[PDB]
Amino acid sequence: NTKVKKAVIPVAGLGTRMLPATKAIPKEMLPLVDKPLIQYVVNECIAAGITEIVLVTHSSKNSIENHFDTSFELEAMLEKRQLLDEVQSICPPHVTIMQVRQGKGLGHAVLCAHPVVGDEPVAVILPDVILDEYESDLSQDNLAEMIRRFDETGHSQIMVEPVADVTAYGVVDCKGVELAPGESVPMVGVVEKPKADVAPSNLAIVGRYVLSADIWPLLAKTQLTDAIDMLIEKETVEAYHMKGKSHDCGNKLGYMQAFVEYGIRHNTLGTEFKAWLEEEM
Amino acid sequence: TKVKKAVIPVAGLGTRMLPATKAIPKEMLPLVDKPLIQYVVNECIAAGITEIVLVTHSSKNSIENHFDTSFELEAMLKRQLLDEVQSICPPHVTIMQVRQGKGLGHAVLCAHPVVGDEPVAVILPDVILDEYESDLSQDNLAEMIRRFDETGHSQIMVEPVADVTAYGVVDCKGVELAPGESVPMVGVVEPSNLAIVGRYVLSADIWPLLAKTGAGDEIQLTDAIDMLIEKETVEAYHMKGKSHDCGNKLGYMQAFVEYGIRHNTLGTEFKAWLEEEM
Amino acid sequence: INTKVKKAVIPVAGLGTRMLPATKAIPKEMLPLVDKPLIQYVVNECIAAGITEIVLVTHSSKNSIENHFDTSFELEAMLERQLLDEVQSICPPHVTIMQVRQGLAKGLGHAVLCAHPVVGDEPVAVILPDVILDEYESDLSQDNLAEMIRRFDETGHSQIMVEPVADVTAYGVVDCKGVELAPGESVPMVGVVPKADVAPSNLAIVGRYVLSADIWPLLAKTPPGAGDEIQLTDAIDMLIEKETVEAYHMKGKSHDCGNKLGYMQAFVEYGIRHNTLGTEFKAWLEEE
Amino acid sequence: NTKVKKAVIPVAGLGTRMLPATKAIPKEMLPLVDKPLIQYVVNECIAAGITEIVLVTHSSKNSIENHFDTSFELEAMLERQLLDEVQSICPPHVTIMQVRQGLAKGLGHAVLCAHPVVGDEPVAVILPDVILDEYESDLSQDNLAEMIRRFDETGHSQIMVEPVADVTAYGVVDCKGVELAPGESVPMVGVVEKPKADVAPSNLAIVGRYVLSADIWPLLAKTPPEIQLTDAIDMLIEKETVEAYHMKGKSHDCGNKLGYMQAFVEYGIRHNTLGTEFKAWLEEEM
């Protein structure tokens, strides 16, 4: 298959932008209607073919792991059925969630997974960014596509998308080439919240990466970006243009918008919710 | 001020919101950026309650933690924020926790040792009384308590429904009730179009009645309620403004939007975004 | 007539340093004396004395203490025999455990003050959990906490348990104006100190108190040290000042499980006495 | 270098033999003087060269992980010698990973759950309620460390054993009647659970330490007609040579009350700072 077996997901220490909702519950457990962000993120991983998920965590984060694990008393009450099928249907049996503690920096959270991952290519996924399942085919596009491409060329993939205001993100330098959703083109560097006038593209790092086993040593020499730009010095790495829509639930308004969008699409209450929104707005 | 303690049963596990509540308490689901329990407690405080008793479960330390101070967190934030965050539980308010050993009537019983034989407020936490459609410091719980204190008559909040077939309606021997008013209730029929909302202000007299009080072998507070009734004058208080049942998925999704539009820093942008998108 | 001391308050919010690393991720109060955590002995002592309301003044990382006394669902499941019933009986049905968080408040005086809202303006017992009162060496249903409560009901005077120490240079020693105390006796104390030539007595403060409702306002008005620190000894000195305080002479033996050596000595002493393994252990001990 | 890089520690089951102490704290967190049993076991894995430990766990046991992680609030609270001691707990080059076991299904099944973590590689299996005495063997040269070096040389799995008086209480190996000296590895032709003394192939009991080849993986994947480690070991013997390794020094079974109380006293006598005193104390008192 693919040498990309593991997805490393850094679990937020404290999602301060979302206080106080996340003062005592992880932001990864904040819900989009009726499921926690991390359940969408894990299913995205799985749709791409990943079966091993390495959560890079902290002490106050047990509920994320319990969400995917079995909940004895809960299930007991449940028998005491659909929901029951559902709660045990959260993590497919062929999927394994692993945990390692980080006790700062995303590049640091990645390095922490080194020992679990080995000296192999890996996927890095940020948990507060949700790629829209209805807007693209997760089994074929995006992370799924970035991995197929990595297998084909051995070139790291870095998901990106066009954004209005560039100063707010980390922009990639694709030497001015235009990219269509779905394509991969070489990147020659990354610019941390560039100043509009000097920004390399309008292409923002989305929070999805498929990286060659070489970042590992680079991470040690080294944030992800600097080992990224160092990797770039050694090999080709490409920007992959995200297909569909993403939701950034790491910012309050982004989260509120996602809440509503997923609300309108809810399998059982979406139409009624949508109707209500229309007679209400 | 005779009523200083509010009992909040939050020890049940919340089914209708699965899978979101599998590993987190339903009481910590956010309405925008504040958990349901924060709105609830804020409501108690506004009414002058200074001691909140959570009748809980092993899995809900997140709720107490939300109200306690998060050291490492505090170690982290900033000036503006750092305030807002300690500020969750003001200094004169105490959150106490007792573990339940099922039913609301039994949940309230467990708090007896903490409350003592005193008048007590009973608050259902997955029901939100809208802070913008009422003045929570002057109305509803605030006032139902102010009236208990003035007259020692118990108060049970109710609001008019549509399908009275769908609900339990209090019997007020036919007296027309309007927002803001109270009038004796003689019981409930499952007589008026008024339903129990989930806020109760009860005389210390319910305790012994609650001890002497089931459907699934659960202790019903309705049962002690009617008992208190045959012993005394209990009044229905007509809720003012709007309530939000956040214990049902749709009701929760709808309050999320209503509150978002009213959000103090993001309400205007979200509302405009919504208006276009929708 | 029933006493008015209805609640015991147990400060369990601190992170116990002298016991590290053992207590690095577990409460010092959950350290076992053979096969039971220190806290169960302490709660049982409250119970033997008739207290049925216990207030733990805790911290976030200590949910295990409450879990100890609650029903342990999965465990009982996987338990369904003796263990089931032993385990099922750890906290009797008529005993209620309440918890309140100490939060930012530093100091023992603060810890006690935190329970005020649960206790009310009522007298209360204050129990430090790392000191274990030997259930074999005295009758906890009549002595010690049980007797200090009775003395407080008979005189209105707050009670402070003390015990005799050969070395006064290492303790909180009381001044009872040189009046002698025999076990079980309470006599007014006018202060608390001590070098040795100037010590007012050989009686050290053990860790148990039965205080009147008057400690409440005093505690709230106790002047802080930095960071709000309110010490209970300070509040105690003002109580002594406001009124009559007696020192009560402990019966039996105490185990200070707050220090390493003492927790070890305790573990051994309770092992030898274990209802099931006492004999075999004691013997194995004589052999070794 | 060795292909044996990972040690799997099954700590997921709930320890009934030690109730009620263990009602709400994991058995692995009980202290032998001033350290939890799991610290001793982790330190032993480290002495043997292991720098990757996989706990196969349960939800109610975060405390085991917190023990090795950074105790931010404590550290802060200490910020001297003790602060160091405290951080030093897990050496920076050693990593603890965790996986949850599904339905409580046995040690065999516990190891099996570590498969995705370890991969198709040889592993060390360590039962954490058995403590190998540090004072009585050189844990950096004998026992697990030796077992691992013999596996690297030969490629033969190593199952640790020690002589017992009563075989009916253990899983016993069959080495074809051949004597093993401490530190010696001898091929085993079978394993048997709790034999009646009259048919027992030896008086050498499985202690609880294993260094297994990557070939036990497919064997552990099989469902019996309860997945048992010894049954897997017996299937492996069928395919390949497996040796029993005779433990050096002394072991402590702290999975049973008496054994834990004895180990607590034995280690208190040896405590670095308090032993002399504690011992003296015990003499006068005994």
PDB file of C-alpha atoms in Angstrom, chain A residues 6 52 57-62 65-66 69-70 96-103 112 115-116, chain D residues 6 52 58-62 65-66 69-70 95-103 113 116-117:
ATOM      1  CA  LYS A   6      -0.117   6.979  10.817  1.00  0.00           C
ATOM      2  CA  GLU A  52      -3.524   4.266  13.223  1.00  0.00           C
ATOM      3  CA  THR A  57      -1.868  15.046  24.192  1.00  0.00           C
ATOM      4  CA  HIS A  58      -1.901  16.627  27.618  1.00  0.00           C
ATOM      5  CA  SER A  59      -3.177  15.644  31.094  1.00  0.00           C
ATOM      6  CA  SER A  60      -6.577  17.214  31.016  1.00  0.00           C
ATOM      7  CA  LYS A  61      -7.537  15.575  27.747  1.00  0.00           C
ATOM      8  CA  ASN A  62      -8.992  12.123  28.620  1.00  0.00           C
ATOM      9  CA  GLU A  65      -9.830   9.185  24.173  1.00  0.00           C
ATOM     10  CA  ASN A  66     -12.938   8.123  26.068  1.00  0.00           C
ATOM     11  CA  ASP A  69     -13.169   3.997  23.617  1.00  0.00           C
ATOM     12  CA  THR A  70     -15.895   2.020  25.259  1.00  0.00           C
ATOM     13  CA  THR A  96      -6.460   2.228  16.588  1.00  0.00           C
ATOM     14  CA  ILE A  97      -6.131   5.446  18.516  1.00  0.00           C
ATOM     15  CA  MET A  98      -2.795   5.773  20.329  1.00  0.00           C
ATOM     16  CA  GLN A  99      -1.733   8.474  22.792  1.00  0.00           C
ATOM     17  CA  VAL A 100       1.551  10.102  23.664  1.00  0.00           C
ATOM     18  CA  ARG A 101       2.012  13.173  25.979  1.00  0.00           C
ATOM     19  CA  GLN A 102       3.734  16.349  24.829  1.00  0.00           C
ATOM     20  CA  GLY A 103       4.588  18.047  28.143  1.00  0.00           C
ATOM     21  CA  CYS A 112       6.789  13.738  20.160  1.00  0.00           C
ATOM     22  CA  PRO A 115       8.925   7.145  18.659  1.00  0.00           C
ATOM     23  CA  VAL A 116       5.418   5.886  17.772  1.00  0.00           C
TER      24      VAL A 116
ATOM     25  CA  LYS D   6       9.483  -1.670  22.801  1.00  0.00           C
ATOM     26  CA  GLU D  52       9.664   2.974  24.315  1.00  0.00           C
ATOM     27  CA  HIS D  58      -8.092   1.576  30.651  1.00  0.00           C
ATOM     28  CA  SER D  59      -9.860   4.932  31.007  1.00  0.00           C
ATOM     29  CA  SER D  60      -9.726   5.161  34.754  1.00  0.00           C
ATOM     30  CA  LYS D  61      -5.902   5.054  34.821  1.00  0.00           C
ATOM     31  CA  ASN D  62      -4.631   8.434  33.607  1.00  0.00           C
ATOM     32  CA  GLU D  65       0.413   8.510  32.695  1.00  0.00           C
ATOM     33  CA  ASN D  66       0.382  11.631  34.802  1.00  0.00           C
ATOM     34  CA  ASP D  69       4.368  13.341  32.450  1.00  0.00           C
ATOM     35  CA  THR D  70       5.042  16.890  33.607  1.00  0.00           C
ATOM     36  CA  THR D  95       8.673   7.621  25.758  1.00  0.00           C
ATOM     37  CA  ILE D  96       5.411   6.253  27.188  1.00  0.00           C
ATOM     38  CA  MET D  97       2.613   5.571  24.680  1.00  0.00           C
ATOM     39  CA  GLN D  98      -0.851   4.282  25.479  1.00  0.00           C
ATOM     40  CA  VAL D  99      -3.510   2.167  23.783  1.00  0.00           C
ATOM     41  CA  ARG D 100      -6.835   1.154  25.383  1.00  0.00           C
ATOM     42  CA  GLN D 101      -7.793  -2.529  25.459  1.00  0.00           C
ATOM     43  CA  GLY D 102     -11.373  -3.130  24.269  1.00  0.00           C
ATOM     44  CA  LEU D 103     -13.493  -5.566  26.339  1.00  0.00           C
ATOM     45  CA  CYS D 113      -3.873  -4.654  21.355  1.00  0.00           C
ATOM     46  CA  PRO D 116      -0.571  -1.625  15.881  1.00  0.00           C
ATOM     47  CA  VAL D 117       1.704   0.281  18.132  1.00  0.00           C
TER      48      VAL D 117
END
